[PDB]
Amino acid sequence: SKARVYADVNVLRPKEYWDYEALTVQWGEQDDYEVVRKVGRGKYSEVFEGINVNNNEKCIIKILKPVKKKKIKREIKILQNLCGGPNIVKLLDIVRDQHSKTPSLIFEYVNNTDFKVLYPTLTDYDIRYYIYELLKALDYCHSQGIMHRDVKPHNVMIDHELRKLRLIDWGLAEFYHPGKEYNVRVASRYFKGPELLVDLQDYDYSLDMWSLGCMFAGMIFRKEPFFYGHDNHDQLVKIAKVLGTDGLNVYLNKYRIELDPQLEALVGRHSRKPWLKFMNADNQHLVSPEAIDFLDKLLRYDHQERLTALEAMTHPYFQQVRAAE
Ligand SMILES: O=C1c2ccc(O)c(O)c2C(=O)c2c(O)ccc(O)c21
Secondary structure (H helix, E strand, O other): OOOOOOOOHHHHOOHHHHOHHHOOOOOOOHHHEEEEEEEEEEOOEEEEEEEEOOOOOEEEEEEEOOOOHHHHHHHHHHHHHHOOOOOEOOEEEEEEOOOOOOEEEEEEOOOOOOHHHHHHHOOHHHHHHHHHHHHHHHHHHHHOOEEOOOOOHHHEEEEOOOOEEEEOOOOOOEEOOOOOOOOOOOOOHHHOOHHHHOOOOOOOOHHHHHHHHHHHHHHHHOOOOOOOOOOHHHHHHHHHHHHOHHHHHHHHHHOOOOOOHHHHHHHOOOOOOOHHHHOOOOOOOOOOHHHHHHHHHHOOOOOOOOOOHHHHHOOHHHHHHHHHO
8 A cells, every 4th residue: 555645755855854763862951941830741741831931932841751762753853844834833942851861842832722622612614724724734744754643632732712723742653655564553542544453554644634534523523532432443343333344344355454353253244324324403503515525535444545635625615714714
């Protein structure tokens, strides 16, 4: 398998662009940034609102939990490469504690409106707007030859007050190289593509589009998460109960994958459940044929069949967002 777009980005660029292990970190001043208040956690980190003591500017302080040198270089390089594309978090500085050597990444200040409280109040328009803004971030990073690999509500930081969106936490992200076989232990369960769940290692940018599809499905249907599985096996079962086992079987044949017998047993036999069957009185004001047409083209077993981020932005669903933009 290979990506249908931007396959050759890291083929044509200098090796220095993607060769993150060769990076040597320029450590800034640890004392320049003070913790003001804890604001949350990333995947392998604790995150704080901070202040730059030189100019009193707000910042984000991301203190990383102990991890391998390779992994920190990967995040830092990807962040330097993507500074400052549309709706990407801005890495400002990298510092560390002299004694314990625990590193901190410093970002431009990002405010956070809790998604669990925010999503119920989004209007039909707001969902078109914010997904479009997310799509800009994704098209940009894909065009720079990077997959995010952990798209989810928490990693899409919305400031509803100021109507800003930031794609955050690039700690699971990777450079795309055609044919390369990746670790499937990425993303978060509810937002893991079928490729990850069936051990298809040579995946690409299209992984992020499944994850967005899952977020978009949860928004319009107000069912969150949309696919609510307990473990990785059950997460596939939940997908198969909506999309149907027939489409799964043609997908597994196409890429020549055999399911583990226990997983195959757990998956079983299911019919496709039309998207319209998820509509109810709570979400009717959000579900339109354009929303469903868009969702349908995102939640596809076959990663090659999914809309690219660039294609998605031009779908008539976002027509009013473009026209206003
Ligand atoms: O801004 C980030 C932020 C900015 C860049 C990151 O890499 C990141 O993980 C976070 C982050 O985890 C975070 C959070 O967990 C809670 C509130 C936040 O404002 C953030």
